[PDB]
Amino acid sequence: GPAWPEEKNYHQPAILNSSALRQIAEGTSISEMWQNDLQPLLIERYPGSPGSYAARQHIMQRIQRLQADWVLEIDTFLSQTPYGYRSFSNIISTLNPTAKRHLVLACHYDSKYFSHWNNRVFVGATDSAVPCAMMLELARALDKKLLSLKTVSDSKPDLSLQLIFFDGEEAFLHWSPQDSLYGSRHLAAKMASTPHPPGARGTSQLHGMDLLVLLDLIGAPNPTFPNFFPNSARWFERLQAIEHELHELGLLKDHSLEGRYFQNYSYGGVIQDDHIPFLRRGVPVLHLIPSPFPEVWHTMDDNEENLDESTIDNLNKILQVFVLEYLHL
């Protein structure tokens, strides 16, 4: 300090060797995630609905049962909407809240509002129940390692982990600047105006965000994630390297390098998503959204039946390795 917000610029991974990679691949369970983390979220959960409450309680209860020292905060606020003033609640789960720096994984836990059509209900399986369940499975699978971050008299982390589950990512109607990103626009502004660490004179919680890794629209077959931003390109390249090495070790399922997920191509345009209010305030973003979107995007067919189990399993392994390497665990 006050150079500590520049540490993210020089931060390097602590790369896992083959033995450790095999351990991570064996330590995550796609069937356990499916039953215990994902299926309870495959419900109608637009903001303010009973399902939104049920989804929030589920996310909190799955984090609270873990051994690591997660601190849960519910960030509840009002916003104008096309249907008038409404309440929204982001979920923030933080290890070591006073650590200056956090790696941040995020997704949205609301589902887009639709009236029931032909007795069908929109549950947003890729969008984003699967991202939610991936974050919960990561917390569970890495629980023993994340517990070592716990602050004692001997070690106090400089860098730790935070999960954000945004409410209200979706428009109530179709997208507009005022009807979308309710939770992320609120939370980015809040973090930008909150000193961090406690007592700081001139640094905010946003300065402490090392990297925002935003998962969206994951779970369909054959996703291709572009390398959107130059100031996170080196971390995109790490995802590529992790995918390549897990592949070569035989630790991925139904996977080829020709059909790899992290491909060598950029994307010039802007995708509206929860990263935008953070990106426009200078937070580095790794946006794990596929291009093109799943074929089922914003249809009633974005459901459990159309999820690709082995692709989600593969991405769990890649993401968990990424997080351990980032945190030097």
Judged by CB under 6 A, the residue of 66, 200, 271, 329 near ligand TYR is 271
Among residue numbers 117 through 176, which ones bind ligand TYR (CB under 6 A)? none
Taking the complex as a whole, how short is the minimal distance between the CB of residue 123 and Zn ion, in angstroms?
A: 12
Q: Which does 291 bind (CB under 5 to 8 A by kind): ligand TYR, Zn ion, none?
A: ligand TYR
Contact between 45 and 91 under an 8 Å Cβ cutoff? The reply is no
Site string for ligand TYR, 216-255 (x = CB under 6 A): ----------------------------------------
Q: Could you say which of 179, 216, 243, 308 is catalytic?
A: 216
Alpha carbons 167 and 273: distance in angstroms, whole number: 12
Alpha carbons 260 and 252: distance in angstroms, whole number: 11
Q: Sign of torsion, CA 158 21 211 53?
A: negative
Pinpoint the alpha helices (H) of the chain: 7-10, 18-27, 30-33, 50-64, 130-141, 143-147, 182-192, 233-248, 276-279, 309-327
Establish if 293 lies at the interface with ligand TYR (CB under 6 A).
yes
Phi, psi (deg, nearest 5) at residue 227:
-90, 90
| Unique residue bearing structure tokens 């836990």 | 109
Establish if 54 lies at the interface with ligand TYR (CB under 6 A).
no
Q: Which is nearer to ligand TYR, 72 or 271 (CB)?
A: 271
Taking the complex as a whole, how short is the minimal distance between the CB of residue 292 and ligand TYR, in angstroms?
A: 3
Classified as helix, coil or strand, 134 is: helix
CA distances for 217 relative to 115, 130, 317, angstroms: 21, 8, 17
Judged by CB under 6 A, the residue of 155, 253, 292, 295 near ligand TYR is 292
Q: Which is nearer to Zn ion, 127 or 210 (CB)?
A: 127
Q: Which is nearer to ligand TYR, 67 or 272 (CB)?
A: 272
Does residue 216 have an active-site annotation?
yes
Taking the complex as a whole, how short is the minimal distance between the CB of residue 228 and ligand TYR, in angstroms?
A: 11
Q: Which does 167 bind (CB under 5 to 8 A by kind): ligand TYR, Zn ion, none?
A: none
Q: What does the buried/exposed string (b/e) look like for 225-254 if buried means 16 or more CB atoms within 10 Å of the residue's CB?
A: bbbbbeebeebbebbbbbbebbbeeebbee
Q: Which does 271 bind (CB under 5 to 8 A by kind): ligand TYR, Zn ion, none?
A: ligand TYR
Contact between 187 and 201 under an 8 Å Cβ cutoff? The reply is no
Per CB under 6 A, the segment of 36-44, 63-71, 72-80, 289-297 that binds ligand TYR is 289-297
The residues assigned a catalytic role are 169, 216
State the residues that interact with ligand TYR by CB under 6 A: 269, 271, 291-293
